[PDB]
User: Fold this.
Amino acid sequence: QDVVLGLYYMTRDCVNAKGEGMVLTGPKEAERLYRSGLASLHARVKVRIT
Amino acid sequence: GPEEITADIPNVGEAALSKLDESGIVYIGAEVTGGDILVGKVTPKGETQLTPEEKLLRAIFGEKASDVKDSSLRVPNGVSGTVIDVQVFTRDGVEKDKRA
Amino acid sequence: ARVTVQDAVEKIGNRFDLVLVAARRARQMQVGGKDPLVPEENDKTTVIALREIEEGLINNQILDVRERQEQQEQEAAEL
Amino acid sequence: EIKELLKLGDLPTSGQIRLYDGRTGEQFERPVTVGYMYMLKLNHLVDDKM
Amino acid sequence: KPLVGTGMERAVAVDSGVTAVAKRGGVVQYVDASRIVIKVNEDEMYPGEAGIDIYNLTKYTRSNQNTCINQMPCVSLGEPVERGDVLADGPSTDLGELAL
Amino acid sequence: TEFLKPRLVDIEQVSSTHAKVTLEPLERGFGHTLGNALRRILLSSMPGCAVTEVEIDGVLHEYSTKEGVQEDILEILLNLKGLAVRVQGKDEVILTLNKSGIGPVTAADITHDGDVEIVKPQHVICHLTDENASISMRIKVQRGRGYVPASTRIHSEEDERPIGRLLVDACYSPVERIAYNVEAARVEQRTDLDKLVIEMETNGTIDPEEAIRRAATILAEQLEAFVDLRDPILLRPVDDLELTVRSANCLKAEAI
Amino acid sequence: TEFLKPRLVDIEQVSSTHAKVTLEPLERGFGHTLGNALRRILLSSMPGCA
Amino acid sequence: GVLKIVKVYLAVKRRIQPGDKMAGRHGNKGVISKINPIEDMPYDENGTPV
Amino acid sequence: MLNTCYRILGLKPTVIFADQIMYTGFAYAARSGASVGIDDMVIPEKKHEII
Assistant:
């Protein structure tokens, strides 16, 4: 019940949050953007993944 | 034989008697912990049947076991309290102790 | 070994035969005084005898080969 | 009548204020319901159960 | 006390008999931690006796469930007390309101 | 590099318990770093004085009463927790309170020492209601930090205290409440600088400059693990050699 | 003032750019004080070229 | 047969604890899971923690 | 998601992945702040006219 709420909140989508459309060189700087407040949690970006 | 409420308890230290009074009942106001003695009481024993080895240990150091057996009321473990009251009831004709 | 015994149940084949082997090996390091083949790593005997099995050092035949061959040296020094 | 009594004490009428995290100092994303509930202590204590 | 109540806290506490309500109206004369002495008004005084009501509060006493019963006075020295007023709080009352 | 150092600029005293402290100039992101780190040290790691043991005469335990005293002893022992006492010279003083006559017993009845300063001298301790009644107590004030309950104290100290020494839980920490904000102060080139306004509500006993000076010393020294640091046979008795009994009358005669 | 200053007990180095640092024992309420005040500086104020 | 009885009254003082059951008036019971320090609890913009 | 891990990867990467889900679900449910007020229980405006 509480693990699913933090998962549903984190993997959600917002139309107008913050940092829309910026491009990221991996998942390790998607956490640098969230922790320093530069991006929102649910916000559509482009990530290079592997 | 009749059991008696005494402070003279066999095979116990002098710090275990540091909370009881001369009659063998704890002081009103004492701060007791688990295992501590509240009321010192003993029963008279029968005759003990010695083992072959324990017949030698008494015959080397010399400590005899008398007709006195410890059954004193102790604080139940896990409880740490403070004695606030003591009530002593006595049968008619039986002599009262110094705290009664 | 410690967290999971999943890697050990393929080297023996059964969940029920793993217990009857690893309790025979850990009996020897408890009361027999035999030496463990792996590093001890401050582990109990049940975790060592499970760790010995998953690195292929203990089987049901190896516990039968070494115990039968240990008697046949005692069956020589007496007679 | 509850939301008129919250205006008399200069509190938000939604009943939800903005809370900050105590360990990281960060602000929570959504406002949190804060108030005064009357709590009881029942007679099932862990000193008696263990 | 509860901040959000229901109006029925004052009728549970007085009717449980665990408080100490005043039988006759009058003026408080001497308050202790264990005794309340109220001097009765002249119009409520029957013409034979001295007209002094004295209340003795039950101090730290065991309940049935091994809890504490303790009555504390909630009036001060020299104030008027009407009939039915609350003089001593019970174990779980607060100025005559039930406070669980 | 292009860093900058802060400074203590303004200490506004609102009351005897409330204060405001401004720290400026800070760079961007350093207002919340020094703001939240100094909120956790001031709420948990500050020293202060508190009542530890109380000894009233004619009283054996805390569940008893007294003739003439309106409150129970469990209510007197919980009023002495809120006693605000600032001790200057020593680490442990023993006070004494003596009062006779009808009226409230306050903190202004304690026989004062030269270096012991009571902050709130109108703190109500007791209430005497009878004329012949007199209270007398010896209050022991210590100095520590944090919060130490009395159930630790009996389990630690095995020494026999006499019956009549009532123990109090000690909450030494003087700080009661603290909040902070990060505004922007004006600097003509560096417009991106910040300020830090730390509120501080407490009892007495602590200068609000000495609190932030001591909180920023506990923090600076906990970063020292980060910057610089990355014949046995001699004393035995004589009967352990199986000697001859003719020598047992010989060795003991010389007091060997 | 008898605070427990820790021992830098471990530097577990996985690669030439990865690390795990263990630091014990600390007073309670000082794992989040020193841990967060170092994380906010390593993310936002470390000088370097780009 | 009884010669004398001694009744001793103790007085214990129990504080709350992780495991002690607490409840409210609306049927919302529960047990305490942790006793958290003050500086880790969430606080509002005035500084008063929950 | 836990069942896809068990069928492709085994038992040992499932127990580790089921704990780290519980560490990440507990951490970001506290970063959000989720409550229930009396404004979250909404009413349709047309409730009186349907009755």
Observations:
- Chains I and E do not touch (no CB pair under 8 Å).
- Helices of chain I lie at 2-8, 12-32, 47-50.
